[PDB]
Structure 1
């Protein structure tokens, strides 16, 4: 061993991801009249942990009927989820919200519902995301929505106000201008731009100000001038497969899951 590890006893592994496939299938009978030896075993040295569990007579458990397979992470997370929503009282103002995995951050400002529950399952995350937004109410309203990477000059989160940024300084960042009239819904793939190797939501105090933020998104509206007619927004996320994952964690307690 170049790494210097000395030992008499065997060295082994534990908790290998995706040991088996979710769908039930054949990728005979299972076990009987031979020996149910694995029943009694000690739970510590992973060797004996990595033995196959066996208890009673069994039959090969038939076959799933349907091919659509729900326990692969992607095919699951394909379905989007709620993210955040808000309104406007005014014309020609901008609202910004961060996208932050902080589990400490508690909604209405923070990840609500499923997503909150979601990203605390594993330490590391990286890759692209899919932002969608949806509009309501008065039409022939215009908007521009620019995406701001972490740390660059940005106006406050969770605030409805007019910006001080150069329109240039905005638009060059990449932008989409659109009319509430014609479509009203949007699907765009967030890029992955970070100076981080990855991002993570299980954090506390100092770092949570940083590594927890995937990035910022701001939206500004124009020509809403007539106060009536009640605009509102909604935003949904889902993850393509070009993103990946790392290193599971323990899931949240009951008291950590909120919803609105």
Structure 2
């Protein structure tokens, strides 16, 4: 031991991640003629709690009949889930929304149904995300979207107003330029630009307003509008292969799972 401790017992590793592949496959019977000693146990001992359970004679389940494994995070959360939606009402306006992992921020100003469930299953998130925005409404509208890391100057979140920034400051952060007649969709990465190791969701105090947000996406539109037509944007998040997840955590209860 490096720390100078001593013990006569054995210390074992508790709750090892990923103990089994969640597809039916083969890595005779499962239980058999031998008497099941794993039926009776002591749960207060972490060594005896790792014993394989059996009580009844069984046999092997066989193999499944679909190729993919739906119980993996990189395939479950590879599906792009809903993030936010908002509408514009006037000309030359600017809207700003952060991607906050915190569970204190309730929707509409926070993570909705499935993303609120997922980012409170674990402690630490580190890596780039994957944003898709969808344009619904007017046509011949020129818009520009850019990405600001946390700790830098930007307009007020969740408020649609005129922009107090200049065009030299917007285009220096990296921006895209679209038109609502040609595309109707933008599939854009979001870089991992932070000064800290990883961001977390389940925090309070001044750690909730610092270590929860990691990035911040804002959109400005021009050439809107003519007489009577609405313009609506909707955002969707997916996860990438460069991202990582650490330290599993107790899931949210049935009163914190909220939606829009």
Shift of 1:31: 1.3
Flag as ranges the 4+ runs of structure 1 deviating above 6 A.
none
Tell whether the 8 Å contact from 2:126 to 2:244 is kept in structure 1 after alignment. Answer: yes
**Aligned runs of 1:1-20 on 2, under 5 Å?**
1-20=1-20
The unaligned stretches of length 5 or more in structure 1 are: none
The alignment covers a number of residue pairs equal to 260
Provide, for residues 51-91 of structure 1, a one-character-per-residue CA deviation record: whole Å limited to 9, x for no partner: 11111101011111111110011011010100000001101
Tell whether the 8 Å contact from 1:89 to 1:227 is kept in structure 2 after alignment. Answer: no
**Aligned runs of 1:94-109 on 2, under 5 Å?**
94-109=94-109
2:133 matched to which residue of 1? 133
Tell whether the 8 Å contact from 1:199 to 1:213 is kept in structure 2 after alignment. Answer: yes
Tell whether the 8 Å contact from 1:123 to 1:201 is kept in structure 2 after alignment. Answer: yes
Q: Distance in 2 between matches of 1:65 and 1:44?
A: 39
Aligned-residue CA RMSD (Å): 0.8
Q: Distance in 2 between matches of 1:140 and 1:226?
A: 10
Q: Distance in 1 between matches of 2:214 and 2:227?
A: 34
Tell whether the 8 Å contact from 1:42 to 1:49 is kept in structure 2 after alignment. Answer: yes
Shift of 1:206: 1.1
Task: Give the match's secondary structure for 1:46.
Answer: coil
TM-score (norm 1): 0.98
Shift of 1:227: 4.6
Provide, for residues 190-248 of structure 1, a one-character-per-residue CA deviation record: whole Å limited to 9, x for no partner: 00000010000010121110100021110000000325210001000010111010000
Q: Distance in 2 between matches of 1:111 and 1:123?
A: 16
Task: Give the match's secondary structure for 1:197.
Answer: coil
Higher percent of residues as helix = 1
TM-score (norm 2): 0.98
